[PDB]
């Protein structure tokens, strides 16, 4: 049988089928031409002919149907900016008239657009200001006049809020029936700019300098304000009043972040604020006052969330999930033993009640009805790298049902879920350890309705390939279980010695040992090159409690590095590893850890590859870096900021073969970071291999560059292993 070759990986010879649906109601979903499916019976009818927009004249990047099904928003001229942000053009098509709307069009270069949650109002951001359309074909109402490129952002995030706080460009939040539009405003006036060249097509005679407001660690941060406007009022001198809700006094005393916005009712919004020292967070719960038209946050309804051992949240304070009446909410919180569990709050009582407990964690709350809360956790079989859907009875917390554990326990140990609008149906998505499996279920009695996609065609194809296998297991260190996985070559033989590649990420709350089925570079390395590809979750890794997660607090570049080295020693002791052929590689945080390990002097590793590494924490952005590292000042944590750089280890790279790779247009981990590694290596006379990727960003993900980088790394590894 053939093996899984590099060309198979790079050409996507063997494709995972998906089943990506969009719920439009409690019982229908859209699926791609466009069909609408009835969840209960599985029958479909054609929702939008794949010929409808043949003559449209543009390629349509995406669509979005209004909640009342009356209009479809068509996105085209898509132009990517950062991880989530982009600009696009939009047309609106009227589904009753079968007419495109040609009047009062959304402008070109629109930065964000969203329907109201009911009806068909639109809110959009253009040139950094917010506009509202009550009707798709009528004029917009301007909401803000302060928008200013790179300086004032209304309703959209700046770079660091996009990447590290909201994971979204959008900073607009409609109230549930669409009366109110809440939004944040960011002021980057004094935030320094990262500047880097962009070369563009070769016809561009002068390179272009990209300038992005980007606060590196300890620098001046954007400031933020929060506003709510009543869009039903757009009957006042066209000038609706934006009512500010100010941060609490405990936040205003210093630098802070707005880190969560969640509406609770039509007239009640909750906001969470986080101090720049991210171990103290405050939730305000604010009610509309009909008589004054203002928003009041009763101090009795304020909730404090703080951490004595670390930062707050996995990456930020968790979202609340409110009961329908808005008088109570559920929220994932670290319990007294350090494990993240669901706590039940009354809005005006400070003590919450944990409704789950144990030596495992809740991953997320997925749906809440009058009777049940549904959540994903890694409880099943005590496997932190597995994921299952559970439902807990709100009137009796001792009644907890695992909805997914036993559906196919051999094939399916990693689930996510997508519920319909009022949770009357749910799609389960199993992603491993076998082939992904998508199924539909009815919540009324948790019956499997039908298999949506089982990947049987890919199964048949893979049967003719010498696929690697995957072992997921643990080693005990200091009476603590630490999980690892190995991608093992086909016909793996414990009596033989294999080269081993340690595939590292190891950032705070990371998890590289899990039950997910992947087809990736490691699949090729194991299948064709007979390399064991191993990953290990040491101190700092996620989903196993705060004692493990917070072990690297204020100390990035220490234990999570040491534990990758120890893991390699442990794997060598297993007897199937050629200890003369151990390599290490990783991307981003993984390139940082790879580099730290290669500079450690441990002698364990022959060679390694760092792709877009962090090299010095003062080069990375404030929100992420300070969360773990505090401030780079003599009074706080400067000594460890300066002790944890790659460059200070340059001399030790004389012991190893290193390949350093970075895209020149990386807005996230700046090319600067690898520019300083290479300069430090040159300064101590260390030879190494290098590759820049012109105009590639942090993902080095254009089609050609993706192929080029994995080809180049494959050559390096094979050379290192005398393959």
């Amino acid at each position: 049988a053939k093996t899984y070759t590099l060309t198979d990986y790079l050409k996507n010879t063997y494709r995972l089928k998906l089943y990506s649906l969009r719920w439009i109601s409690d019982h229908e979903y859209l699926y791609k031409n466009i069909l609408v499916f009835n969840a209960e019976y599985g029958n479909s009818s054609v929702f939008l002919e794949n010929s409808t927009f043949d003559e449209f004249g543009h390629s349509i990047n995406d669509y979005s149907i209004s909640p009342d099904g009356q209009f479809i928003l068509l996105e085209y001229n898509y132009v990517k900016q950062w991880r989530h942000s982009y600009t696009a053009s939009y047309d609106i098509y009227d589904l009753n008239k079968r007419q495109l709307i040609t009047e009062e069009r959304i402008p070109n270069n629109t930065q964000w657009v969203t329907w109201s949650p009911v009806g068909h109002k639109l809110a959009y951001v253009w040139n950094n200001d917010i506009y509202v359309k009550i009707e798709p074909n009528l004029p917009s109402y301007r909401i803000t006049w302060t928008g200013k490129e790179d300086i004032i952002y209304n309703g959209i995030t700046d770079w660091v809020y996009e990447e590290e706080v909201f994971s979204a460009y959008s900073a607009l939040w409609w109230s549930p029936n669409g009366t109110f539009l809440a939004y944040a405003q960011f002021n980057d006036t004094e935030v320094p700019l990262i500047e880097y060249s962009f070369y563009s097509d070769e016809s561009l005679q002068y390179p272009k300098t990209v300038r992005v407001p980007y606060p590196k660690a300890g620098a001046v941060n954007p400031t933020v304000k929060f506003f709510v406007v009543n869009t039903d009022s757009l009957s006042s001198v066209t000038n609706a009043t934006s009512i500010q809700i100010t941060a609490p006094a405990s936040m205003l005393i210093g630098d802070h972040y707005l880190c969560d916005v969640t509406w609770a009712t039509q007239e009640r919004i909750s906001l969470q604020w986080l101090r720049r020292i991210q171990n103290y967070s405050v939730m305000d719960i604010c009610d509309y006052d009909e008589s004054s038209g203002r928003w009041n946050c009763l101090v009795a309804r304020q909730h404090i969330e703080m951490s004595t051992t670390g930062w707050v949240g996995r990456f930020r304070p968790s979202e609340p999930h409110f009961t329908l009446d808005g008088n109570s909410f559920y929220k994932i919180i670290s319990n007294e033993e350090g494990y993240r569990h669901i706590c039940y709050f009354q809005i005006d009582k400070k003590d919450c009640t944990f409704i789950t407990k144990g030596t495992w964690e809740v991953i997320g709350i997925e749906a809440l009805t009058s009777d049940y809360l549904y959540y994903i956790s890694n409880e099943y079989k005590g496997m932190p790298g597995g994921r299952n859907l559970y439902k807990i009875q709100l009137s009796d917390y001792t009644k907890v049902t695992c909805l997914s554990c036993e559906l196919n326990p051999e094939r399916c140990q990693y689930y996510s879920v997508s519920f319909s609008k009022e949770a009357k149906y749910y799609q389960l998505r199993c992603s491993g350890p076998g082939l992904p499996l998508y199924t539909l279920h009815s919540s009324v009695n948790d019956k499997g309705l039908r298999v949506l996609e089982d990947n049987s065609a890919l199964d048949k194809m893979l049967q003719n390939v010498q696929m690697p296998s995957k072992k997921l297991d643990f080693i005990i260190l200091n009476e603590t279980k630490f999980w690892y996985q190995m991608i093992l070559p086909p016909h793996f033989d414990k009596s033989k010695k294999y080269p081993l590649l340690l595939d590292v990420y190891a950032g705070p709350c990371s998890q590289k040992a899990d039950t997910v089925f992947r087809l990736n570079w490691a699949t090729y390395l194991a299948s064709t090159e007979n390399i064991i590809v191993a990953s290990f979750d040491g101190r700092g890794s996620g989903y196993q409690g705060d004692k493990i997660m917070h072990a690297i607090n204020r100390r990035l570049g220490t234990f999570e590095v040491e534990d990758q080295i120890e893991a390699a020693r442990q794997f060598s002791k297993m007897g199937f590893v050629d200890n003369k052929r151990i390599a290490i590689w990783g991307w981003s945080y993984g390139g940082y850890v790879t580099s730290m390990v290669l500079g450690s002097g441990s002698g364990v590793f022959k060679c390694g590859i760092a792709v877009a590494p962090v090299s010095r924490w003062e080069y990375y952005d404030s929100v992420y870096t300070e969360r773990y590292m505090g401030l780079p000042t003599p009074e706080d944590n400067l000594d460890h900021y300066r002790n944890s750089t790659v460059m200070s280890r340059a001399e030790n790279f004389k012991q190893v073969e290193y390949l350093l790779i970075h895209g020149t247009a990386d807005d996230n981990v700046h090319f600067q970071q690898s520019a300083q590694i290479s300069k430090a290596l040159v300064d101590v006379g260390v030879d190494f291999q290098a590759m820049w990727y012109t105009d590639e960003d942090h993902g080095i993900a254009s089609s050609t560059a993706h192929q080029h980088i994995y080809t180049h790394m494959s050559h390096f590894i094979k050379q290192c292993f005398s393959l």
């Binding site: 950032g507 991307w587 945080y589 993984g590 792709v611 942090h698 993900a701």
Partner: peptide, 4 residues
Amino acid sequence: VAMP
């Protein structure tokens, strides 16, 4: 997030 330092991740691709």
